[PDB]
Amino acid sequence: DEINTAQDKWHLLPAFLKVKGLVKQHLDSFNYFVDTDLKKIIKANQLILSDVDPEFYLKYVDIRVGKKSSSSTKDYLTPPHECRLRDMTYSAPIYVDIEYTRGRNIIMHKDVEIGRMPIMLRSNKCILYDADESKMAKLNECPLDPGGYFIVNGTEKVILVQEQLSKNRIIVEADEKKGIVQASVTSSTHERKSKTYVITKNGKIYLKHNSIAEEIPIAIVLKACGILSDLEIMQLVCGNDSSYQDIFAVNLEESSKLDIYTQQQALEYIGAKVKTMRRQKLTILQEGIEAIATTVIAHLTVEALDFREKALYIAMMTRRVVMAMYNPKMIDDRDYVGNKRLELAGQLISLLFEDLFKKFNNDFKLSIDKVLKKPNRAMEYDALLSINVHSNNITSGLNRAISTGNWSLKRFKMERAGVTHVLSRLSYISALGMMTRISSQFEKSRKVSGPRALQPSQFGMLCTADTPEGEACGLVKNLALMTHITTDDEEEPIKKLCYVLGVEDITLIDSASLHLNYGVYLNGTLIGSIRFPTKFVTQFRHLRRTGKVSEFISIYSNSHQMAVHIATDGGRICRPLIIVSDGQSRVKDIHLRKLLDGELDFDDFLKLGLVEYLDVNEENDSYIALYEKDIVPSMTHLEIEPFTILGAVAGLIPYPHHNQSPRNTYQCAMGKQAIGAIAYNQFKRIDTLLYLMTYPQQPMVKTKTIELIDYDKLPAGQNATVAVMSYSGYDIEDALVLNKSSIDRGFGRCETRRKTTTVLKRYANHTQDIIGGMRVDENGDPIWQHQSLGPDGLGEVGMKVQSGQIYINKSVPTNSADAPNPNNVNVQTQYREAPVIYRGPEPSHIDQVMMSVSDNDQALIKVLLRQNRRPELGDKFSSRHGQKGVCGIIVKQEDMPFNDQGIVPDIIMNPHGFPSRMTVGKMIELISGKAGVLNGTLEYGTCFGGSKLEDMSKILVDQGFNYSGKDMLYSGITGECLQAYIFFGPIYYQKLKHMVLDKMHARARGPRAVLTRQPTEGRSRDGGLRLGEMERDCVIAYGASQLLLERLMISSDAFEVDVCDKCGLMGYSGWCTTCKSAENIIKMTIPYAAKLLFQELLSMNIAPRLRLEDIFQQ
């Protein structure tokens, strides 16, 4: 084992995943909220007071979640696998510590219960933190479950990682028809939601805002901030020796039109036309209302006295509005990935909790003074009694906002809905990729396919091959394998550190020199106006690589303008890459060997300075190398591992680079629907609907991805023996034919299980529900419905059910809404039945039945059914490389061909897909499989590499077969050889969802709607399908005039109406009721949907006066 840094750089990627797994985006954000962010909320809501009894105060000192301070034990907690079986919330209580004025003396009390907040599993606060497969075996939980999701009141949901544009920054924009605008939103953390627009009306620059009644030309608002000399402005906006002075020259003369000319007169021009907010005092000075008008705007910076920096921040904003008017090439998209701030849940539920807590400590405050407006109830009164009534608003506000994924915010007044989603346990990887997925904001640019497409600045940031299709085509995307999000730390020390590094100050520099030099932009704000950044920025990296400053900083530095950029806002995308200094890297394979000893982890490399995190903005400036054989003496930041651009749901495809790129996007949506095994406790859990596979098989041509997620420890699907050939004509377009023997051997026998539940309900008249059953008839208890109903009324475990055959009896009192009579007169027989009947066209079994109680004392019943089935023809299969397949026919083993050894192929597929679909991956997998089969050794098919071909054919020919594996075989139906050679071997085939046994539906004549009397839409609603308008026009294109009448009212909507002749409207059964003689009545028929039509227009003043003729006597 001669180790080297040429091909063993892969081995440090598991050292990343071991100490730092895949649920960074959910665990660490939730943990940092619980560890740190709980204190930073309560400190800004402290010291509740009352106006009545002014010497009373309550203040809380600190808050804690979980354990007390007296016991100081870990906890005693319900198990979550137990908690999901009782439809309860898996939550943890919050303890607060308070002091207040009881009376004569003030008193401090500890550990006060205010609510129970939910906790996601595998956090450090839950009991599943760092188990050893025995405590978790005692808690019967699968250790291969990643976790990261709530178990509120039964169902398991998860917060999706939302995003928006980069807040608190400006963007450039161009539009031809309506002028060009400059959007700049700012959202400070206290109620502020402000966005500013810099518009261009016919060559004149303005600023409109939704707190100002009109627009203002900028020549006023620069003098209002102090900068008035009017030669400073063009020196700041335009510079010297350009055409910018010519374009900007329109805006100068308007200060002469308004005749202001000074700093003092510049203010009150705004406050004249300001949209004045009602402060209920209205002190307004006509000097300070304009001073605050230069404070509540552009909320990045607020100035105490000078307004100097805020002025130049406007000058930076209005500089690029003319550069965009100079040429439309300088504008940018809002689709570039650097203009996006992805944001996690733990700092997002911080917004949700602070809304509830400010709603908590004022409703309780409304209770206090209502007691304190009493003479007697002001001395001995204690307020700790009134806590628990108001405490319920938190927990119900928690669980409702997580079950119903809609959030009613108040300080921002915004209704982001659909934020929570029930996770799918269809496959093992189906729950993996939902943890790593991105949901956009759909900013109503539905016409433009720009954001629908994929940006080239995504290589290694997040995954590019997993993106759905259909209604969600490009607005949902998925995480890559090596990815970290940043977090903010502070801007205070770095602005002190750059002064030490030799940058100037904004309040000292001449305005001519800033356009000559560059400028340090701290989150878009100029403070120093740096010169010669190449000395400046490289001395900063040596502070970061050695680790004097934090590593989540980006030193993006453009050259289209004269500027450099600093970003520490946090919540932006990045990935780590190893530093390359010069024509030699910093590989140091002896340290890579010292990793595999086990003391030198991934963390110490960035501690020493062998690796650092890079965002997309640092990837502007950097020059990442492909390989160690590609090093230039001008070449930095070697790419650590090339196949890390695909996630674990994109990683399991063997040899993706040989396959076509749309054939990789098809499988990731369908790999989530492949059935198999789910968890270790899957026979213990009781969930709504489960597909299970009897015999899975770990695939032959493996990948480095699947062994990093242990996908082979629980596979889904199995390997066939594929003979790609035309046979019997039943496979023409991607169909499949398999052998009748191997299904009897047990190839592909799945299992279907389905939960159903009932709740025994308690009524206000103290009447329960009873499970009496097995009414008897002719010496035997069981009716044809009652053979499987058990002695207790609960259906007996151990036997099948068929259609009909009540399996849960239930009887309900008939006085379900009557008032309780305070006596005992007549309650002996009131139970009418509401039994539960097994539907379905196929006989199934129960799996097992449980009973329990809810969080409140109310009885719970949960039974789960069980049936297996064999995949007969019609069932949908796939190929892991994007080849769907429906079973064409199921023929005998004697009908299938056979080799010299008699090996019968499991399935056959037509050859007519591989040239069209351009899928090379199956063609190599069979070669990589069969030679690996005969060698017994499982092989690695990875991206950008994997097992090669020329070494694999040498093993395949030493066994004595074809070097290309395209063998010859005999015939099954006539015996002799076949004139061609047959490409034969084993290929891993998964079974999908969407089987035919639960998709056969047909309705002949059944239920109808109430308002339309139409057949009811819905397969569970007993169907009747919509023959729509696009199909309606094709019938007239045939010219058929009677089944058009028949299939539109006779088969659907026939209804007989008697109508009056003169003043002709309908009447009822035999009457006219508009000329009440009931004589001139015509029996005919119309659509019922036409009958309601001229009844609803009659509701308003419209008279459909009907006129008749006879059919005959032309």
Next chain:
Amino acid sequence: DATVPSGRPETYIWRYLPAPPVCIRPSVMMQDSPASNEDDLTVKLTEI
């Protein structure tokens, strides 16, 4: 046009209003409770 009974322009603003049958506005029972979820057609007419 003349010669018709409703040919006055006086009947082109609401003085009377007819009530439609309850088949058009069905009292649907959602079975979330023993109370019926009564539709918006009746309660707008009730405020009238």
Next chain:
Amino acid sequence: MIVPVRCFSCGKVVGDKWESYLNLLQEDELDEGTALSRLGLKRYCCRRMILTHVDLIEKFLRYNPLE
């Protein structure tokens, strides 16, 4: 779960060999490819049945209801 009694492809019985194939690995540390050739399995359609069977009955039995 457990090994299927027969081969899915040909149909020869493999239920007496799972313990035997495991026996030739703990004691007598051997190449896995030549292990079942000594055991008598020549056909490569049956080599997939034992190489790639994940035996997950061992992880399932630990969640027994009987402590």
Next chain:
Amino acid sequence: PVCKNCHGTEFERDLSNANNDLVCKACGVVSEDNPIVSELESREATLNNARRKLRAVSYALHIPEYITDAAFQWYKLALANNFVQGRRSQNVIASCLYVACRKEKTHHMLIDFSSR
């Protein structure tokens, strides 16, 4: 409920072929085809406040709501029987709680009410 030929009183809804027709077993004539599926104020105000007060200490004493709902009708009859007038409003409803606490046979005592 009554057939037109046999006048039977037993009707059986057949769901074997998803038609959901109604038919008797005696002669076999259908009953119905094409099923049509269903797709004072001062007295009011003094219970609206009393509803708030029942909900208050039930949140304090962790009372599950099938008692608080059941206890309102115990308050409703004594509202009609002139038990409320003169007596203190806070005192009468807490006595009304313990009735349903006793009928439901709970662990809840009586001094837990009076201590609050």
Next chain:
Amino acid sequence: TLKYICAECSSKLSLSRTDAVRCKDCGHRILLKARTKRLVQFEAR
């Protein structure tokens, strides 16, 4: 009989009806039914 058994206590309890929902020998509140004695017919395919 072979009546109701606990989840992890695994204790046969013929608990009389409308009385309790918990188990003996443990505070656990989720209940398991034991399998019947009656024979059931199956095929072998």
